[PDB]
Amino acid sequence: RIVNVKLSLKRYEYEKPFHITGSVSSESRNVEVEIVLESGVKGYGEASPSFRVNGERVEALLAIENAVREMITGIDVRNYARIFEITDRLFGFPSLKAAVQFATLDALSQELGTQVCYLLGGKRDEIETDKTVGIDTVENRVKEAKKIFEEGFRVIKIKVGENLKEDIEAVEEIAKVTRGAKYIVDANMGYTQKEAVEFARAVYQKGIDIAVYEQPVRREDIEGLKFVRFHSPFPVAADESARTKFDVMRLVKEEAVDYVNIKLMKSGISDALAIVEIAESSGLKLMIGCMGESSLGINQSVHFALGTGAFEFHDLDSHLMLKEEVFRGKFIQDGPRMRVK
Amino acid sequence: RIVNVKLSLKRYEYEKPFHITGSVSSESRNVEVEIVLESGVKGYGEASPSFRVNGERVEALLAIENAVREMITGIDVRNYARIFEITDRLFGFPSLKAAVQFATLDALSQELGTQVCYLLGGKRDEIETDKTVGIDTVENRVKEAKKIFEEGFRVIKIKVGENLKEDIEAVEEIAKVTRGAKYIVDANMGYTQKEAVEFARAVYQKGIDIAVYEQPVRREDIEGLKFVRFHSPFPVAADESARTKFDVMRLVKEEAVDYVNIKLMKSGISDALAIVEIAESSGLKLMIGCMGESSLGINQSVHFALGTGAFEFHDLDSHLMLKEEVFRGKFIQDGPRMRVK
Ligand SMILES: [Mg+2]
Numbered sequence A, B: 001r002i003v004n005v006k007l008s009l010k011r012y013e014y015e016k017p018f019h020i021t022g023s024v025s026s027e028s029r030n031v032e033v034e035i036v037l038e039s040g041v042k043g044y045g046e047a048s049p050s051f052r053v054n055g056e057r058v059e060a061l062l063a064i065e066n067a068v069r070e071m072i073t074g075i076d077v078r079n080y081a082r083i084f085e086i087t088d089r090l091f092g093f094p095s096l097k098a099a100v101q102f103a104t105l106d107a108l109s110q111e112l113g114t115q116v117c118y119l120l121g122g123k124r125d126e127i128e129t130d131k132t133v134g135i136d137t138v139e140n141r142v143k144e145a146k147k148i149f150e151e152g153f154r155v156i157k158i159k160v161g162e163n164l165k166e167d168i169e170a171v172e173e174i175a176k177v178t179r180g181a182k183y184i185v186d187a188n189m190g191y192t193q194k195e196a197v198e199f200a201r202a203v204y205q206k207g208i209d210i211a212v213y214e215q216p217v218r219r220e221d222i223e224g225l226k227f228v229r230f231h232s233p234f235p236v237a238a239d240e241s242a243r244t245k246f247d248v249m250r251l252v253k254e255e256a257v258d259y260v261n262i263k264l265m266k267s268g269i270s271d272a273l274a275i276v277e278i279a280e281s282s283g284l285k286l287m288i289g290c291m292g293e294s295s296l297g298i299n300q301s302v303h304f305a306l307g308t309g310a311f312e313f314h315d316l317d318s319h320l321m322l323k324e325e326v327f328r329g330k331f332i333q334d335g336p337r338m339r340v341k
């Protein structure tokens, strides 16, 4: 049983400012979660709160430490479903919900003598992540893309959303110098429905293929997501629009998207598991993403992906963008490849 | 790693012939499944094939033992998701798919020093099952119902579907001698849409409440299930119409039913987990049922229900209707109650 829970502020600085539509980040402020069991076992998780997406603020997460402690201490991690249901009440603190739920599985797997990925199915032994090119001048974007390409990455995620004309140019210029790579374009809600369609058609006309076109429109515009899906050639994904299992059931019912970018930071383990099942029971396909997690945090998604093996693409590169002294993941990072120990 | 998979015929006779719409059974022929690991650990499952619902035949299941061995021998149970994906190909032998998948978890749980229910979440420590009153003369039905009530069962499942007039009479008579009990009425596809509605209204008019009204119409008549749901006062459940996770996604999209009676014999563990998540992500509610499983087979559903804790009602009484010399479930049967050891 859980005898204590501790929350701690952990700051990581980006190697370079990370610019996306409506947001520039120079630092990633996360909340580390440690769960202690009567047996002495300690489970760890990391919350990377998002004000833009989840409406969270790091100070707010740290402020409810006592409440979280009261909610879960006294429960046996072998009854993890009880912990999941309880933490589901933390829908206003989803990144914390995620960190606590994973810490629970982390502690449980240790007690059972296995790893989290195996507890979840042990589907895959290896996955590959893409790497992101933040918004910058076309010249700098091209430079970064070439660099990411030389590092061995074959899926390059390109941020766009603030300047349609320049975004088109940027994608076209990046494609020319990274022949052989697949591309994921993420607008982070920056385009109107029609601009989103025009962006896709312009790129398509140049003979470029986009593997996943992430959240082109505003989060509440479900009909807009569908409009883009039905009027442009590339698979459309919901990110900001897909936070809970309920959001996904609606997206599927409305036939709004081809993909859903699952993020533990938005859904927690509980909703992520539901979303994986919904996707496997429908025409929906999935990719797994991240926010500002460090290696300890990305580890949560690596085990989820390896265990479920439910993702077509993996955008788990936040830890590669942050400055960190010691690697704290429970997985092996081999270039773009991530493997189980 | 799996080194052996054994299938064997096990016959169990009913204490009394079991009569339901379009089917009378005096014997239950099951296929016991044993999976042996290199470590010596042995996992067990049981398939209770259904010609009527799944189109299966026991002889057919037994005939494919070599194929099953070739499909999963050599796979480590810690990669159970791989075994699940492979066995999902046995959609034509769903009861065997179920037995193999559970035996896999039974074996894995032992290697991890835990139980299947805990591997699935350990949500609950106890569940209660109803007991069924088969079709017979109103006099024999009321007699059996009274006997069941006296045994401590507070949820009584009543079979109907072959004679609306008598069915109504039967439910009305049973209700007066079992005050305090909840009732589940199961027509096993015997009624037309209008008859189904009339049945519910007739019973409703007498002040009788039906907790779950199971599959009133034919399996392909999804619109009919919806019609009954929208035109009669009681919760309507899909049983025969809900075999796979895809069937359920469709039922949810069509808003066809209030309930889905999940059976491992129809869905196997893989699809059952998907249906649980779909239900928890929608307005759908669930009950868990059975076919002709003996105690070893019912053990599979007891662990699934205890672990997920996703069911409002449990209809796991097939082993209570069969003559069995020795109890073989890895659970405690205490009257209507079933608990974890
Ligand atoms: Mg995104």
Ligand SMILES: [Mg+2]
Pocket: B186, B188, B214, B215, B239, B240, B261, B289
């Ligand atoms: Mg039924």
